[PDB]
């Protein structure tokens, strides 16, 4: 249900075993857990300028 647009790179984030989302400075989701493999995936929005 979390909708977004970006590149799904490897996060290198140490989530606690209950945690599902990662936030850094705002309401953006910086890192997200894979629902199937439980791999922690980064959310970086696509390149812009």
């Amino acid at each position: 249900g979390l909708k977004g647009t970006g590149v799904l790179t490897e996060s290198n984030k140490k989530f606690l075993p209950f945690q599902q989302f990662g936030r850094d400075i705002a309401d953006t989701t910086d890192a997200v857990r894979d629902p199937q493999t439980l791999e922690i995936l980064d959310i970086t929005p696509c390149s812009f300028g």
Binding site: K13, K14, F15, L16, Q19
Partner: protein, 35 residues
């Protein structure tokens, strides 16, 4: 010995570390230094 506290609606500033662990907190309605 067992301890019973009670919960209040209260604002905190939580110190997350680099590992995602909450290491410290400020009770924002404790004393005016905390405000």
């Amino acid at each position: 010995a067992y301890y019973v506290g009670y919960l209040q609606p209260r604002t905190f500033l939580l110190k997350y570390n680099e590992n995602g662990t909450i290491t410290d907190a400020v009770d924002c309605a404790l004393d005016p230094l905390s405000e």
